[PDB]
Every structure is written in C-alpha cells, then in structure tokens.
Design a protein around this nucleic acid. Structure first.
Lengths: 75, 116, 136, 50, 64
RNA sequence: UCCUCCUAAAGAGUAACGGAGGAGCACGAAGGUUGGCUAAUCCUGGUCGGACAUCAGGAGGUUAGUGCAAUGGCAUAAGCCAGCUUGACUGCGAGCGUGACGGCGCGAGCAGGUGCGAAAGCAGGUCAUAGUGAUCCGGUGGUUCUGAAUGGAAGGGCCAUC
C-alpha cells in the first residue's frame, strides 16, 4: 500500500560564502531557520533568506546557542 | 529572578534596534539613582551618559529616584546630546514599563530636543 | 529464539557487511569465542550453539550472549513472481564481522571450556577461535 | 468543504466588492469588516452579501 | 493553395515589433476567491511567449 | 493529482507493483499590533482524592506545546494570556529561486489610504512545507471601450467574480 511521494522542493543554499550577490537575490531556501538572517539580510515568510543590499555573502556562528547567521558586507 | 525576567523582556527590542543600526537611548531604573545612556549603533561605545548618582546633578533635587529625578536626568541627557551633535535616537525601555519614571524621563528628553 | 520486541519497522534494507567488529575483547567472562570469518547468524543458529554449551558445561558457570539478531530477513513464497512489494519477514539474523566475540563464559576450567566452545562452533556457519580474557 | 463563499459590498455607492469565505453554521451573523475601496480611495465599511 | 491560419491561435497571440508574441495569462478566469491578490495582480498584464514554444506559434499563424 | 521522511551515494535532482504516513481543510478568529507569561516528567505535605483532578515547595531545563501526518524550525519565543483592531488593503515592484512550457514561489522599495504603540517600528493573512483543475461555453455587478446608414439598444471587449 506504499508508492506515494512528493515532488522535491529544491531547497538548500543557493549562494555560497564569498560570492557577490545583487539585492533581493535568494541566498538560502529552507523549511525552518537553519540559518538566521544577519546584517543586510531579510527573512521571508517561508524562512527564505534574501539579500537586502549588494555585496559579498558570508556565514558565521554567533549567539549563546552557536546558531548560524548569514550576513552581507558591501564589498 | 527579576534580572532574568527583565533581560528576557528587553532582548527583542535590543535585537531590533541592533539590526536597525541606530543610536539608542538606554535607561536603567532602580529604587534610587535612575541612569541613562546613549549607545552607538555598534553597541561598543557610549556617546554620553547622565544620572543622579554624581554630585554635579544630585545637589539640587531633594531625593533621587522620583519623578523629579527622572525629569532632571531626562533633561540632562538632552543638552548633552544636542551639544554633542546627535539628534535622533531610539528609546529603549530595557524591560521597564513605560509608565512612571521611565515615561517622565522620556517626556523630558523629547521636549528638550531629543525627538523620537 | 532471540528476537526484538515492538521494533520500529517491520522491514529494513539488505545493507552490507563491510567493516570490522567492535566488541573484540572479553568483557564479562574469562573465556570467549571470537569470530574469524564474516557473515550472519540466524536466531536458530544462536539458540543451537547456546544449547550445545549449556549441556556441555552441565549448567555449571555462566553464559553470556554478545550478539542479538535485531535484523529481519524476508523471503518470497515459492512460485511467486518478482515484484509486488517486499517479501514477508521470516527470520532474524545478526551481522558478524571478524573479531566479534560471540559467546562469553566463566566459572569453569580452561580445559572444559575449550571442548564446550568447540562443540558450539561446530554448529555455526563462520570460522571461530578460542580467546581468553586479557589483562587490560 | 462546509465553508462557503460570500461577497463583501462597500457601503459607498461604488460597485466594488471583496470575496471571502465564512461558516454559516457557527457564525451566522453578518460580517462588517472595514476595508479599502479603490474606486473612492477611502476605507469604508463592507457588508456581507451573496 | 495558400496556407490557412489557425483561427484559434490568432485569437490568443498578437505579434509585436521585434517579432515576439504577447498572450494573456492562463489562470485568471474562475476560482478566484482562494487566490492571493498578489498572484492575480501579476497575472493581469500580458506576457511574452517563451522561446521553446515560439516555433510552434510561428507555424500556427504564418500570415499574422 | 498533491504533501513529509527514507531509499538518494554530505550542493540540486534521481527509478522500482521499494519501505513508512498524510491532504481534497480549518480560522473574522486560530489574522495584525502592543503588553505580559514560560512547559513535560518526577519527589515531599495536604478532605473527599484513589497511580493519575486542584494547592504549596523542590529537582528538571523543553523529554512540553506548536488546529491536522511527517520533517526542519521555534526562548527575541513561531508556544500561553489580555487590550485595541482589520495590512486577510489597492496600484505596482528592483532583483532572484524553480520549471520543456503552461506556470509556481520569495521579495526590498515607491504612491495612495489604514490598524496597533509614547516612539523606534511591525502589518500586502496564519511557524514553513499538502487543502487543488487549464481552455472553451455561459451567469452576475461595474465601465459610452466598441456598437457594422444615423441616435440608441442588443451583442462583444476590459475589470471584479461564479
């Protein structure tokens, strides 16, 4: 009675650390918030992370819970 | 714990101001000697501070830690900030209800030039 | 007939038996039977070997079983075409890698221990050897 | 799908309307939301209707 | 005989200056209550025919 | 047909009559904002009351909860309570993700007019991911856009919707 499946949602990181992006570009597609928005990064209703400014994207770990953050520096 | 509850209360506001990147007027209230501080957006340096703990401001008001004290400190921060140059700031409750002394300090500050 | 209780899933993938054994040392008794070859032992084989030693030692000493099946195996019924879903679970097997200690034992002389293990190994499908508890 | 669709008609003379859904079994009374009417470019009261 | 235009195609595609074709979006006819205003708003303007199916459109209406 | 996990070999994708489960909704509030709060499970004392109602204290730190299966996420709580409310708004939309295509998804910002707050600010539905059906034909309301001699009308077109 098996045989059912769902179409893959093509999640994952779209832009990796150290590459320039344009404002509004999608950086990470995720179900929850595995990565939290940092500086110049906005979070969508579906927890999508997009660039709010033009620059280089970088990843880092911050906070007491060592949770991962994505930031953008104007470079 | 009173402190733990207060920090938890103000964490969301502090984070919101931090990511917004704007100078914030932070006020600390106690049974005596209400404090006030102006913090740069990075959060690493204090632009200017005032309070009723120093004799320069504690030599006039009858008692520190009342409505009159809050107005004096709220006023005191004003001309200091205006003299420094910074005009616009974001008020931070720091987990204190914006009802009594905190409101009086803010009301004195806003009417003294630090509109926000 | 060792078998788990209320396992999470009825069926599981075939997998592979690559790698190397972890429980390679005697931990409970003073003598043990180490696995030299690689393969899988069914629940029936484990029961048969256990009965052989208990009779050999005449219920003297202690017996430790260091392997549990915890892996169902299916088998299609005779005269059944390929497909139409996974087969039904038939028996449970334990994957054995070289160096795995199968049974442990204590409370008997070394001489009597050797024959007891030899009888058990005669009813197992994998090459085995006799080992003694080491000091550290 | 017991929930059924309704029409919200602006209190102004304009014919603009909104469309939504509601459950008549639980909340049989009318709906009086205050929404924006672009024909007059003002926020007005919208009444439920068929 | 001269080629016959596909009349159904001629009622759904209009030719543009650079040889492209504009068509109406195909999800704004009915069942509109459950749709977000954002999706309905974006479907209102006319859109250009994709490259892959452009060749099919050319054959359907060789005259227009 | 659609959703979640595994198979799937640490980007994405990836088959089988392979292994497990769900959906064809619900909610004018379960939405928006402002203010406040922080579980499960155990130990001790206490009427009915008893292993398991409610009260007090202690260990515990989220094993709780999150309208609905699963995964990811959630203390700044996305979890729980209350006040005021309709941003579940209109016209757009830089720039991206995803598809052979039809299409689907995210979105800063601008104009108009609103709600909450002293304010910075938040709000273009709901913690996210299922709750859905192209085109044709026809119905309803608005709009002189058109209306085949002229002035109208019928019928079409455009917009909203069935």
């Amino acid at each position: 009675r098996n045989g059912r499946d769902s179409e893959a949602k093509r999640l994952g990181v779209k832009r990796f650390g150290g590459e320039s992006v344009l404002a509004g570009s999608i950086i990470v597609r995720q179900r929850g918030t595995k990565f939290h928005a940092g500086a110049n990064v906005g979070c969508g209703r579906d927890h999508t992370l997009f660039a709010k400014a033009d620059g280089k994207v970088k990843f880092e770990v911050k906070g007491p819970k060592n949770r991962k953050f994505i930031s953008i520096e104007a470079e | 714990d009173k402190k733990s509850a207060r920090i938890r209360r103000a964490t969301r506001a502090r984070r919101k101001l931090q990511e917004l990147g704007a100078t914030r007027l932070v006020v600390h209230r106690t049974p005596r000697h209400i404090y006030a501080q102006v913090i740069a957006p990075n959060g690493s340096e204090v632009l200017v501070a005032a309070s009723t703990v120093e004799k320069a401001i504690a030599e006039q008001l009858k008692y520190t830690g009342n409505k009159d004290a809050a107005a004096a400190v709220g006023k005191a921060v004003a001309e200091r900030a205006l003299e420094k140059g910074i005009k616009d700031v974001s008020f931070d409750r720091s987990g204190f209800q914006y009802h009594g002394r905190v409101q009086a300090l803010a009301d004195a500050a806003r009417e003294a030039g630090l509109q926000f | 007939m060792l078998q788990p209780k209320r396992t999470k899933f009825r069926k599981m993938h075939k997998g592979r038996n690559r790698g190397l054994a972890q429980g390679t040392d005697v931990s409970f008794g003073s003598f043990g039977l180490k696995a030299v070859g690689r393969g899988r032992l069914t629940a029936r084989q484990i029961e048969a070997a256990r009965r052989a030693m208990t009779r050999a030692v005449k219920r003297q000493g202690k017996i430790w079983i260091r392997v549990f099946p915890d892996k169902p195996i299916t088998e299609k019924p005779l005269a059944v075409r390929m497909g139409k879903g996974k087969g039904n679970v038939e028996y449970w097997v334990a994957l054995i890698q070289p160096g795995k200690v199968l049974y442990e034992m204590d409370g008997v002389p070394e001489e009597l221990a050797r024959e007891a293990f030899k009888l058990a190994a005669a009813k197992l499908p994998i090459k085995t050897t006799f080992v003694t508890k080491t000091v550290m | 799908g017991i929930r059924e669709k309704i029409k919200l008609v602006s209190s102004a003379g304009t014919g603009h309307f909104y469309t939504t859904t509601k459950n008549k079994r639980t909340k049989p009374e009318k709906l009086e939301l205050k929404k924006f009417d672009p024909v007059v470019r003002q926020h007005v009261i919208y009444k439920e209707a068929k | 005989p001269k080629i016959k235009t596909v009349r159904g195609a001629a009622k759904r595609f209009k030719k543009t200056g650079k040889g492209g074709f504009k068509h109406k979006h195909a999800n704004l006819r009915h069942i509109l209550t459950k749709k977000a205003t954002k999706r309905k708003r974006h479907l209102r303007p006319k859109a250009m025919v994709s490259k892959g199916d452009l060749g099919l459109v050319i054959a359907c209406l060789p005259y227009a």
